[PDB]
Subunit: 129 residues, 6 copies
C-alpha cells in the first residue's frame, strides 16, 4: 500500500549512515555508495541539497568526506524529506472532493507528518542488526 | 506516497453516501453517481466486491437500491480499502534490509493504517452536513 | 500528465474496432483480441461496463455491435465508464487563483478533446 | 484524471511569485519559500535550471534576490515546463498502438501545448 | 519500470498456492486469502478472468486448469494485466535511441515466458 | 507493459549522440537539444551527474562542448542509468511477499541488469 521514492529512501540512507558514524570523523560518499550498492554519482545529486540546507557538511582532503551539520537528535526525518522532496502529500486532495474524504486525507497527512517530525536521526541510528 | 486509486476514492464515496442516508431507505447507484458527477456504470464496477464483502446490501424493486450491510460505526475506511485495493500493510523493501534504514517507512505505514482502521463510516458522515 | 490506464487504452481499441465494422454484423471479442495481439480474457473485463452503459450490445448466437451510431459516441463517453471522471485535478488547500489557473486550463483542454472526438472520426484512421 | 508534478507545480509557483513582484525589486528565494510553506533548499533545485535558461536573473548583494529574465507577458507556462520537465507528452504513445489511438494522443498533446504556449506569466499573475 | 499492479501480484499468489496444492483436492479463495493475510473479496475479483482463460477450474474451491509445468507467469500476467510487449515510444523513433528499451522489453518477456508454476512452487514460505 | 523514465530516456539520448559523434570534436548541448526537440536547460540537469561520473568531459571555449569520457565500447547503458536513476529495480519487492514472487522479481531484475551491462554505447550507436 505504501510507496517510498528513491530520492527519499536514499537521502535518508545517507543521513542514517552519517548519524551512525557521528563523532567518528568524515565519511566519504564513495564508502556510503559501496555499503549501499549504488553509484556515488547518484548519491552526489541527493547530498547537494542536504549540504545547501546545512544538514551535512563537506570536509575536504584525502581523509575528507561528509559529517552531519548538527547533532543526530537535532535532525528529523521530516527536515530531510522537506529538502529533498518538498511538501508531504500522502493522498492528493482533488478539486471539488467531498469534505468527508478531504478530512480523511488531512488525518492521514497529519499522522505521516507527526511520524516525520517526531523521528530524529539519533532514533533511527539506534536500530542495529 | 500512499497508493489509493480512483477505485478506492469512489468506493469510499459510495459508502459515505450510504452512511449519510442510513435508516432512510435504499439509495440507487444512479442517484449517488448523479450527486457526485460520475458514471453510474463506473460506480457499478465498485459495488460488486463491496456487496460480496457484506459492506453493502442490494434491495430489489422500483424503490430499491443499496443500504449499508452494518451500522456506520462498524465499518472503517480500512475495511473498504482492503476489499477494493488489497492489503494496507505492504511497503516497498530492499532485499536483506537493515533495521535502521527500514524503520521510518514502517512507522509511516503503521500511522497510515491506524488512521484507516480508526476512521469509521460514522466518523466520515460526521465530517459533513 | 494524463493517466489513461491499460483499461482505457483497450476499451478504446474495442470501440474503434466496432466502429470500423459498424453495419457489418457482430464482431467477437476473440476476433478483436486476435487483431490486437492480446488476451480475449483481458478484453472480457472491459466489455461488461461498456455493455451496462449501452455503448455496446451483445448479439446472442454472434458477438458485439455499437449501442449507437459511431458519430454519437465520444472518447469521453468511453473513458468516463472505464476510468472514472475526467475533471478532478490535484489541488492545494486554500489555493490561490493565479497558482491553480494553468492546471484548470489544461484540464478543460483535455476534456474538450475527449468530449469532441467521436468514434466516426477515429474510425477514419487506418493501418 | 490530470496529474500535476511537484517540479512543475513549484517551478511555476516561483515564476508566478516573481511575476506578482515584477518592478518591486529583487525577491529572495527564502521569502518565496516562506510564502509557500516550502524549504528554500527544495526551491533552489528548481531555480538553477530557470536561471540557466535566462527565465530568472539573480541580483547580488545585501538587498539581492531574483527578478524575471524578461517581462511577464514574454514568458509562457510552456517555456517554464519545458526547462523543468522536458517535452510535453500528456499520454505516452506505445509501440504498435493503432493509428486511431495515436491520433487521439496527438490531439490531447496539441491541446495541452496550445494552453501552455498561449498562457503567459502576466496572464497567471492577473488572477487575484 | 513494469506495469505489474496489485492485480498481477495477487493473481500470481492464487496460481502459486494452487500449484503447491496440485493433486491435493480443491482450495478455497478463503484459505488462500487467510494464508496470505488479505481480503477474500479482493481475490474474488481476480479469479473470474483466470477461470475464463481456463487457468483455474472451479469445483468448494479451485484447482489448476493444467499441470504446473504447463502454466507460465506470462500466461497469468497477460490475462490480468494485458500485453507484455508494448513499450513507450517517441513518434519517428530512431533505431539507435529505441534499441535499449526494446532489448529490456524482450528480456522481461523472456523471464515471464520461461518461468512456470512448477518452478515457482519449489520456493517455500 | 514497460515504462521508460524521462531522465533515463534523455540521459541515454545525450550519450548516444556523443557516441555517434565520437572523434568528431566537441558537441554542444545546444545542438543535442536542437536535434532532439527539447530544452538545452532540461538536458543540462542530466549532463552534470554524467560529467561528475567521468562519462562525459567538457571541452572549454567558443568551439567547445562535450565528448565521451571513454571509448564508446567502454561505456554501458547500465553505467549511465545507475548514475542518473540509481539502482535497477523493475518490480518493487514488498514486505512479506512470498519467496516465489520475490524470486520472480529478482529474475526480472537480473535479466534487465544483464541487458544494461552487456549493451555498450558502441552497440547503440551502430544502429
Ligand atoms: Cl565525499
Ligand atoms: Cl535569493
Ligand atoms: Cl555545451
Amino acid at each position: 500500500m505504501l510507496k517510498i521514492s528513491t530520492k527519499g529512501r536514499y537521502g535518508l540512507t545517507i543521513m542514517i549512515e552519517l548519524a551512525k558514524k557521528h563523532g567518528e570523523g568524515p565519511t566519504s560518499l564513495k564508502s556510503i555508495a559501496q555499503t549501499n550498492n549504488l553509484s556515488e554519482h547518484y548519491l552526489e545529486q541527493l547530498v547537494s541539497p542536504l549540504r545547501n540546507a546545512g544538514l551535512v557538511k563537506s570536509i575536504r582532503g584525502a581523509y575528507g568526506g561528509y559529517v552531519l551539520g548538527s547533532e543526530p537528535d537535532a535532525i528529523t526525518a521530516g527536515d530531510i524529506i522537506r529538502v529533498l522532496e518538498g511538501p508531504i502529500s500522502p493522498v492528493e486532495v482533488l478539486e471539488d472532493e467531498e469534505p468527508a474524504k478531504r478530512e480523511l486525507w488531512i488525518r492521514i497527512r497529519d499522522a505521516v507528518k507527526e511520524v516525520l517530525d517526531s523521528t530524529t536521526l539519533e532514533d533511527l541510528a539506534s536500530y542495529t542488526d
